[PDB]
Amino acid sequence: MTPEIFVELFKESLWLVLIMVCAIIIPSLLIGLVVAIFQAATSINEQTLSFLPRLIITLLALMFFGHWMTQMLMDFFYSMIERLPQVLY
Amino acid sequence: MTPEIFVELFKESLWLVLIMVCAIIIPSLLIGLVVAIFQAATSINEQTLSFLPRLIITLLALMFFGHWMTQMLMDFFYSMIERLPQVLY
Amino acid sequence: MTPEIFVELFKESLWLVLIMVCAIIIPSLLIGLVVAIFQAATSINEQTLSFLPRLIITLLALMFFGHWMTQMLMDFFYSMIERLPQVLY
Amino acid sequence: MTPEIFVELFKESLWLVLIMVCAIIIPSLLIGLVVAIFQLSFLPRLIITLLALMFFGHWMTQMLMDFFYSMIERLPQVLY
Amino acid sequence: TMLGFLPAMVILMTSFTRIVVVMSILRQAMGLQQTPSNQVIIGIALFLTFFIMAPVFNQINEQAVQPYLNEQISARQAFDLAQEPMKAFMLKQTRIKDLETFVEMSGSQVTAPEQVSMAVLIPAFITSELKTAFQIGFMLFLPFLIIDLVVASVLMAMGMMMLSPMIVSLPFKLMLFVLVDGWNLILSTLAGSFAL
Amino acid sequence: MLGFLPAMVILMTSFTRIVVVMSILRQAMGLQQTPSNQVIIGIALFLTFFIMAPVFNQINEQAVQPYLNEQISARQAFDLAQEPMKAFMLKQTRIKDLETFVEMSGSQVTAPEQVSMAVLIPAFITSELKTAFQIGFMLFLPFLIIDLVVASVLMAMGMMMLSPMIVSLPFKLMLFVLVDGWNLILSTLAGSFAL
Amino acid sequence: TMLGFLPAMVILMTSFTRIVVVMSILRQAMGLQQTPSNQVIIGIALFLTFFIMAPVFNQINEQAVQPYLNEQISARQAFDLAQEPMKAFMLKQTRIKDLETFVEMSGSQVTAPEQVSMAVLIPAFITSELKTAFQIGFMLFLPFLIIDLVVASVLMAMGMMMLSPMIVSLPFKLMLFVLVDGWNLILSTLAGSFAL
Amino acid sequence: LPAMVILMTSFTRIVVVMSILRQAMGLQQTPSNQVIIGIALFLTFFIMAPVFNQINEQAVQPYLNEQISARQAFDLAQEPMKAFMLKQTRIKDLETFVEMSGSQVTAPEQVSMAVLIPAFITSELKTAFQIGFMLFLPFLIIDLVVASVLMAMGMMMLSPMIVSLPFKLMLFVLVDGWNLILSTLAGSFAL
Amino acid sequence: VILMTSFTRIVVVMSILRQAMGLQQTPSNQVIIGIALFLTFFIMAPVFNQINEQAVQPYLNEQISARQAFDLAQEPMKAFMLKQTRIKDLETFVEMSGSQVTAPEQVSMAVLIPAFITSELKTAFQIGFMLFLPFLIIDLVVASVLMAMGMMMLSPMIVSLPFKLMLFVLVDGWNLILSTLAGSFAL
Amino acid sequence: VLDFIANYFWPYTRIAAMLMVMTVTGARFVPARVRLYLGLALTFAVMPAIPAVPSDIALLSLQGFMITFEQIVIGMAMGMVTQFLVQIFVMLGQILGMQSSLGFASMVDPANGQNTPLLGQMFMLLATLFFLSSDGHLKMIQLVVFSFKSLPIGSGSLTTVDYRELALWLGIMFKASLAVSLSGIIALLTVNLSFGVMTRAAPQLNIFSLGFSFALLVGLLLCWYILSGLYTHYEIYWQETEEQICRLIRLNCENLY
């Protein structure tokens, strides 16, 4: 019911978002990096070569982090529902 | 209804997406890569050279893998409904 | 209505795409190839040199093959309508 | 209404695109050719493109306005 | 309560929802934000239906409505007579394969299909329509997609990676659709798909 | 009260589940309101009369037949109609939602058949919509599989533009008709009930 | 029960559709996505249709509304009075091949296209208006597509690959639009298409 | 015109929370505004049951056995509905509307119903737009996550307001959603 | 009636600007309609003054009949619009309605309005071209700087939008264009 | 009998017209019956603080329609400012999104294309909460109350100089959205230049090699950072949008809330 408690409540959600997006992307980031390095090593200049492995790694990570992410977000939604009465008053 | 039956039901579709995509694309990646190897062996620096050869295979495979793909996805959609009553309750 | 009439009818559209695309594009590949060979023999490291003659070719082909292409695609649409009633029932 | 009146009407638009783009790019083409014969080559390649723009702009817009007007003219015969 | 849902049922008992879905799949197929009006779609479909169901409306008005001018009966004839012609109509379009499920799950298994309850045929008629509508769609859709694939490919061939191949490819689709007489063939096939 | 009775009485049925499911499907196909609201609220309205046939017949025999012959009405007939509705809905709600609402209402129950309608319904709707979303997600995924593969083959060739939501419509329609679509779907939506 | 459908008939009865369709194709042609321009399209086409049907609307007024002072009549030769001039008008803008592929579907053959059933001309009138409109659209579209191709091509040629040739083509699309005096010709051409 | 009475209740809050939810996950014109009006008209009968009981078993039936002035029934029923609101309205809203009324700042449980109504509805709207937006926020986490993951591999075009709707529904049902959302709205009323 | 006003031109200029920024639908078309509706009163105010003076007060002072007052009300509106329409464009439509007139003042309402709207759209585009000019210039110059660097991880539109903003507000932005939409209607 | 509605129509119209636009009530999520019965109830409450409407002005007469419009104008005007308020943050959101490359479909294609109002849709929640946490709507209603005593019924309306100042607000919105987001914008741009350096190192790295990864990350991170002290700027701009409404209904500011 305070302005600061709302902004705190939202920075929480943004932190959740950011950690999720890093968890998912950083594998894609590293795999794109290494495939680009392999490109520049032999001067193989191709644009969408690096779309197969990056997509593959993103799918594999979605398989991998499938449970931790949903558990995190569900915990967050639970905490949200816990905070409602104090928001009423 | 469980946080586990919906994670596994998820992993199924993710695995389908993975296998479909790789089956379609690996020929395209391979032909593009050999085109780039030929470019390097010929000092050729072209950007959209490896498009047509890559779309040729990306299409030929989609006709060669047509029935297998539509059968696999169809069978999946079928299994998405046999378990429908078990999950509704 | 059968899984094979819709996959073979689909092969037909994909075949159309393939033949139209290769008709329009192969000359562009030829001009791009010879331009890159020209650069390499002349030790010319230019990127968008090729685009002008290559665009010339693909815009010439759109007028060389125009009537044939719009005839092919029209006939295809016609065969689609013709075979529709044998698929509806 | 006939396929051929639509195919030719399209071929002419393509001819326009071709003759228009070349008038613009050929100077960049030639300057790039010479500078590469010497060999950076983009900022000059932009200068000369702007120069060709300011040079041939009146003729380009005139040609396109002519094409628009002719398009308008051959319309009622195609409608019916 | 039977005031705001009548427009959604009096149309659906008819062979109306097919042309709607067909023309609405086309309306997106053109690579083109709607541009007939939604009202245009509904109106061309409304008139196509008043045109197709003429054997049935000519029987509704003739056997039930005009007999209900002298009225000849206290509102009982039309409630019971208007049902058989529509049932005989839909039953020619309802697949038997789709009806088999809708009867065995209703329980009242009748040998004579025309003796099925109206509330069992209608839901069998709808699930049979949308299947036909989607078939006709996937038939009519493919050419407009061949154009788009070939256009996007030829564009990518020069490196024109950003040209948004949905502006440049609209003239080609509209050209093709004009060449083939378009609607004349289309709105005859839908008129011809209602084998009655 | 007339401004709500249409929405009040339609909710006692399984209308909402069919509505939400067909809506999720309509958006799964990516179709921008192609079967308009007057299409979906019509089809899901018909499937109600198809499903609620037993309940409706018992209503007519035990309420409308007594109302046309005027045995007793508007006091006893309304109550007699209240019964089979509870019989139907009560067989479809989960236990957990019902105990939740009955502990919330403060009035304690010993026989689940003996919840008042005003506490029965609000537990039915929550146990219906939850099933509706479960079904919807369970029907959705196969379509999503179609989108993400299409939306990846394009980028594999370089075609950043050309929204898959235009090139992946034919695949989805072919799939949907090959699996017979509205046959299997509308049967499970009709077989899910205990009625 | 017709509070939703009726609003769609009035625009189909008149030739409101063609202007909307062509100008909405043109709106996408400019690459200009505006719900504001989308809304004002209705206003433009609406007042154009006012100006166009001023002869027919004024004649219908003189035949019905001015007599509707004493009104002399009720709904028998008053409705069928107004039914006539609209049928005369639409008939001059439809094709004949379109109308004959429809009357054959109706089966109600008439020796006189003037004595044609209203419920088959309008379904033939719309397939004709849409075809004429798509023709006009493919006519008007080409110069803008040429602008787009030239723009993307020079951008790609100079090397600016990643730049989107859709945010920069719009100023030149407006230049070419105004240099041709814009709507003044276009609407004129549209008014030329409805040659009575 | 009578629909103010139902809107004097805890009706406008549930309507708003459900409307924020329907729009939280992609869905537009999914279950029609008529449907959510229905769900709210039911949750209100479930919540306000003690109030309607105070009304019925204390003023309604004795009015069918009238032995009283008809307006006395409203007078004795004007009080419990009042007492219900006074447990919900904020203090700031009440004092500010006492100011705005021009009447002197008098003790609570004493101000007329006419000042109570809008002070009640504005407090309800405040509570509702907060509850919903804190239930909204999670369903937006998923949207941002999936849109970012898309943009990661790219594809630039797959409208993330549908490719996320499966995740939204799965995650809304994994918490059972309604047995938490429709319950807390019933537990958010001490009366 | 809102079309008889200038709002038609105003909102089109608004949306032209919106898309120029590269920030699509960011000013919330509801808000755009609001601001454009408010300008219309800042533009039409002198006109509405005369509209009130001519018959409104006299009609309320019972100095003119109903239909006569209504006919008088359109006059200053016609005069105002006649200074915005173009000669050729008004000519096309007055001919296309057939019934020619000697004085443009004597042209009918329902036939001046259409020629008015197209004449307004044309000049609106004439304005909007000027509006796109600086923004397109900025996009081009930033893209060219990037290409001289040639880094390609730039996507000059997304890196150019901040420059579009820091160079719209830095030049006082809306105040200048507003002044043009005020000076554009030299009544 | 008791045709009272004729006595208080104008104040109700001003109230509800202010309401149909105000960022909380006149938004969506609230069916029109709610807002209508809210406005109609407010009048009964402020019935004391409303001067007698000028009699002799029948509603079913031109004289009445002129003033009724002359109040709808004021009502729309009061709310549209608050709309500008929340749209400041909406623009903050859409700038920081389209800079993160999150919203990208409409930046490459301003046409129909595809829009992603996600971050903007979130920041609108903030601005609709800040306007609610600090009870904006109460102050906004009190201003309408005072309006019946500063811009009374039948005595004038906004003047021409008022509209012009009001239509300047679009410039104010762009100025505010930059004053708030400058820190994050500059940082994101510097990081994009770091990208450009690392890519000039080798021309292999393209939009489909490491496309937008660091862009998405830093765009979200600096957005979370801006979130930290965001209430302060909202407080400042609330003062401007409050004095501005004070300018319309003159009201002699610096006297009360």
Residue numbers in the entry:
A (entry chain G), B (entry chain H), C (entry chain I): 1 to 89
D (entry chain J): 1 to 39, 49 to 89
E (entry chain C), G (entry chain D): 104 to 299
F (entry chain B): 105 to 299
H (entry chain A): 109 to 299
I (entry chain E): 113 to 299
J (entry chain F): 8 to 264
Sentences reproduced from the published study:
Type-three secretion system (T3SS) are multi-megadalton protein complexes that are capable of bridging from the bacterial cytoplasm to the extracellular space. At the core of the secretion system is the highly conserved export apparatus (EA), which is made up of five predicted transmembrane (TM) proteins (SctR, SctS, SctT, SctU and SctV in the vT3SS; FliP, FliQ, FliR, FlhB and FlhA in the fT3SS). Here we present the structure of the TM region of FlhB bound to the FliPQR complex, in addition to the structures of the FliPQR complex from Vibrio mimicus and Pseudomonas savastanoi.
To further analyse the structural conservation and stoichiometry of the EA core FliPQR, we chose the homologous complexes from the fT3SS of two other bacterial species for structural studies: the V. mimicus polar flagellum FliPQR complex, which has a longer FliP sequence including an N-terminal domain conserved in the Vibrionales order, and the P. savastanoi FliPQR complex, which is a mixture of FliP5Q5R1 and FliP5Q4R1 complexes by native mass spectrometry. We determined the structures of both complexes using single-particle cryo-electron microscopy (cryo-EM) analysis to 4.1 Å and 3.5 Å, respectively. Both structures are highly similar to S. typhimurium FliPQR9 (root-mean-square deviation (RMSD) = 1.6 Å over all chains) and S. flexneri SctRST (V. mimicus FliPQR and SctRST RMSD = 1.9 Å and P. savastanoi FliPQR and SctRST RMSD = 2.3 Å). We have observed four FliQ subunits in the S. typhimurium and V. mimicus FliPQR and the S. flexneri SctRST structures; however, as we have previously observed FliQ to be sensitive to dissociation by detergent in the purification process, it was possible that the fifth FliQ is a genuine component of the complex but was lost in the purification of less stable homologues.
